[PDB]
């Protein structure tokens, strides 16, 4: 309701954090019982769907603004088969799985990259530049991942260094996803840097293209803009 104000009234893209829908659904469901309502399979409130639905349907892009809904999602039963998330998926179109591990690699930000996904990535909407580059990347990351598996166990020149190169490119790309931080600048030092899309698409593409590969990788580490990566690249090449 508030967000409807900001959307419509304030014409905005309201960001709606709903944290967590799991708790929501659950909250409804808690009542379901008491309400003598028949809940559902898996216990869910019967209304699980409507509950979600109308609500999701109440979120959108009006032609005033958007209520862009970013929903923090505690995962019920850590599956999605738990009907709601599956349903949620119906309403999910950009999906965030954060990689605790990547973060643990000191990478900041450090999502699960391949499961930083969107059904809405397109060579159309987001165009092929994005798409493809990404497809190349996503793939690449994986490819790098693939090689990781080999090398990991077998020490090295277990690769040919084009694989290494891609591995490296990927690393840079990887690192470029790391971005210095503003909010936790108090901790980190540096600042939250913001990356206009073209620099992004371009950015990785370049790294991918190896056009930058003759430079180090921490360059990309803690960078927003591909320039800020390039600049740091140079800088790491002292």
């Amino acid at each position: 309701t508030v967000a409807e104000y900001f959307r419509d009234q304030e014409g905005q893209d309201v960001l709606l954090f709903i944290d967590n829908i799991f708790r929501f659904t659950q909250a409804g469901s808690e009542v379901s019982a008491l309400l003598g309502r028949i809940p559902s399979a898996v216990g869910y409130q019967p209304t699980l769907a409507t509950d979600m639905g109308t609500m999701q349907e109440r979120i959108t892009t009006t032609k005033k603004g958007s209520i862009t809904s970013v929903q923090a999602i505690y995962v019920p039963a850590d599956d999605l088969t738990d009907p709601a998330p599956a349903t949620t998926f119906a309403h999910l179109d950009a999906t965030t799985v954060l990689s605790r591990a990547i973060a643990e690699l000191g990478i900041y930000p450090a999502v699960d990259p391949l499961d930083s996904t969107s059904r809405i990535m397109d060579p159309n909407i987001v165009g092929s530049e994005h798409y493809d580059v990404a497809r190349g990347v996503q793939k690449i990351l994986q490819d790098y991942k693939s090689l990781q598996d080999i090398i990991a166990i077998l020490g090295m020149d277990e690769l040919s260094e084009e694989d290494k190169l891609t591995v490296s490119r990927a690393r840079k790309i990887q690192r470029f996803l790391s971005q210095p931080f503003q909010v936790a600048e108090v901790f980190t030092g540096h600042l939250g840097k913001l990356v206009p899309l073209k620099e992004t698409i371009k950015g990785f593409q370049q790294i991918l293209a190896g056009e930058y590969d003759h430079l180090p990788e921490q360059a990309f580490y803690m960078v927003g803009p591909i320039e800020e990566a390039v600049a740091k690249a140079d800088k790491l090449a002292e």
Partner: protein, 255 residues
Amino acid sequence: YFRDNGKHALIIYDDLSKQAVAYRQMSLLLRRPPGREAYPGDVFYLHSRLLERAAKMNDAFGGGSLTALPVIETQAGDVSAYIPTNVISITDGQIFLETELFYKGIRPAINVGLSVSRVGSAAQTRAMKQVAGTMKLELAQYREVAAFAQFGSDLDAATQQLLSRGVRLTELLKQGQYSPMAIEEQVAVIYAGVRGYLDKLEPSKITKFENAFLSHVISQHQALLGKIRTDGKISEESDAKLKEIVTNFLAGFEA
């Protein structure tokens, strides 16, 4: 009441499991629904509010606190278990205890990864944090290899050590039956292991070390222990004081 009387009280709610049953029963007997998993819904609410009534209060409340250590004694790691799932969404972490260690004689019991302090460190002594930081890690890497080819199969040396280290720390992570500690004792022994001093020992003897070592510092290095309690923390000196004490003492402990 304590909380509002400043006081930081510790409640151990022992156990909500038992409650749950009763309560569930209560609903049912009241004919009233239970809920999900056949047991009440807002027994979560019951607790949610119950446990929300535990808090760390500001200063106005005399810093008010109730530290709540709620307890559930599990059947079959049923965490999946309704209330546990619930609870899982509620606490500030959960302390997973592991039997295997117990039968092994190992006390603590714990499965650590399962154990969590979401909170982690902020309430932690720097003293400990400083030695412990390092330990958590030493175990962490250790743990993957703690899992790896555990049997009589080699490892690379790095890892032969980590394993040793890990193992040592395990002993260290034992704690006797009805044998509480204090942070310095702990930090001390942690320091001991961290700084590797007892990898040296083959594992059985750790326990002997620790006690002996403890009774030793208890004799002398209350100087230090007291100090460490005081500084709350290790200074480079305290470290240095430790360093010798342990090394030599350790040397004495051994030979």
